[PDB]
């Protein structure tokens, strides 16, 4: 038995209400009335929590924003008044034979204003340069969309290279984005130059705003 | 009514390890009962299944390596692993899916060859040379440990917290946590405290 959902809803907005679909191959209603349909959420790094079994019953400490309805192989999770903290993965599964299967997990996206990324930088640690190696450490937090780019420049230059970035979901209470972008080099590398530059350029406000430091 | 999950951990490949699974509220020899686990991909994998009949089920890819079994008399559910490989790596939950679903918190199984390595902190602070007001951004670098289950804590007490996904780098991971909090009171000292328990390390750091 097969569930699909599609990856990702339309963005919503706070306070609007939301809807997630989810089918089956094969009908999860049985022979005694029920249907074998739950519903639970996965938060980052946080365990699985179930929001809804046997179709229509709300597991313990789920508020009635939640509900679910529809057929024997069709089905809609909803979610009246959608709130910042409901942002997180969404799966539809079935408990009615054995080979327990999953459907893949439906994201819901937090639709809110634009919003400025408040960059900083940071000049490697004295404790880090000792043991041999510099690495440049610069935030980009709160921003909205996630869309955006990163450039670093050592002494004015074209870098690339030795940088790793990294992101963060959707912020369960303001529903932005932050970013996190370093650049590893060695302790000499470090010590040569002394114009490091931290460029971001949010794709929809203009102006990249920029940080760096000697 | 819990479950949990015990026994995960390091373990080279082709070695062997145990998982067991008690619980409160839950008669175990009344159902199905069943292994699942989490690939970091973060889709559901069925592992086994017991029935109360003793009737086991497994899924070609641990048919033979795996042996799912019970003890009636203690309430105990068991995860007998053998022939690990690197792609059995997950968290393994222990799950009484039949009904209400329920299921632990999982233990964390690492079926690798590297060795454990505890983490390096480094205080992320700005210094001189660039903009110091209202609401500045602290933050700690934690570089170079394996294992990758780590935890940022900043004071105990703080909600403008931002900890990024840990990136691999050169076989070892390396992750970054920042905190942002009024100018007006810096000179109260900040500080964040990183936990390693896959090395029962923990390092704290004062900004500043
Ligand atoms: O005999 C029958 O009616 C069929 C029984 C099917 C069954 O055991 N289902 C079943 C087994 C395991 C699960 C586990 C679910 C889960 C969900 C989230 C996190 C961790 C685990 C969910 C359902």
């Known amino acids: 038995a097969a569930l699909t959902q599609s990856p990702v809803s339309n963005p919503v907005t706070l306070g609007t209400s939301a809807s997630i679909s989810c089918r089956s191959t094969?009908?999860?209603?049985?022979?005694?009335?029920?249907?074998?349909l739950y519903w639970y959420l996965q938060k980052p790094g946080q365990s699985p929590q179930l929001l809804i079994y046997?179709?229509?019953n709300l597991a313990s400490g789920v508020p009635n924003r939640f509900s679910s309805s529809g057929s024997g192989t069709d089905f809609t999770l909803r979610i009246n008044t959608v709130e910042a903290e409901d942002v997180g993965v969404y799966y539809c599964?079935?408990?009615?034979?054995?080979?327990?299967?999953f459907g893949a997990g439906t994201k819901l996206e937090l639709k809110r204003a634009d919003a400025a990324p408040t960059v900083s930088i940071f000049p490697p640690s004295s404790e880090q340069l000792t043991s041999g190696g510099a690495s440049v450490v610069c935030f980009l937090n709160n921003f909205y969309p996630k869309d955006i780019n990163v450039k670093w420049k050592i002494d004015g230059s074209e870098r690339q290279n030795g940088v790793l970035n990294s992101w963060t979901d959707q912020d369960s209470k303001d529903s932005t984005y932050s970013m996190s972008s370093t650049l590893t080099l060695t302790k000499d590398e470090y010590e040569r130059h002394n114009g490091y530059t931290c460029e971001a350029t949010h794709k929809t406000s203009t102006s990249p705003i920029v940080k760096s430091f000697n | 009514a819990a479950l949990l999950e015990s026994g995960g951990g390091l373990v080279k490949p082709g070695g062997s390890l145990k998982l067991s699974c008690t619980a409160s509220?839950?008669?175990?020899?009344?159902?199905?009962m069943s292994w699942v686990r989490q690939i970091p991909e973060k889709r559901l994998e069925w592992v086994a299944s017991?029935?109360?009949?003793?009737?086991?089920y497994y899924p070609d890819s641990v048919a033979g390596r795996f042996t799912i079994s019970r003890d009636n008399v203690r309430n105990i559910l068991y995860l007998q692993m053998s022939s690990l490989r690197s792609e059995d790596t997950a968290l393994y939950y222990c799950?009484?899916?039949?009904?209400?679903?329920?299921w632990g918190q999982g233990t964390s199984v690492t079926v690798s060859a590297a060795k454990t390595t505890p983490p390096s902190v480094y205080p992320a602070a700005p210094g001189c040379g660039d903009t110091t007001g209202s609401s500045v951004t602290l933050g700690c670098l934690v570089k170079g440990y394996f294992p990758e289950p780590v935890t940022v804590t900043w004071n105990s007490g703080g909600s403008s917290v931002h900890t990024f996904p840990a990136l691999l780098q050169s076989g070892l991971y390396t992750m970054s946590s920042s905190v942002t909090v009024p100018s007006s009171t810096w000179p109260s000292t900040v500080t964040c405290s990183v936990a390693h328990p896959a090395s029962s390390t923990t390092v704290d750091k004062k900004l500043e």
């Open positions: 799950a009484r899916g039949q009904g209400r679903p329920y």
């Open positions: 509220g839950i008669t175990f020899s009344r159902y199905i």
């Open positions: 017991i029935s109360s009949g003793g009737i086991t």
């Open positions: 094969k009908s999860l209603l049985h022979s005694n009335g029920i249907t074998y």
């Open positions: 046997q179709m229509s």
């Open positions: 599964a079935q408990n009615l034979e054995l080979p327990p299967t």
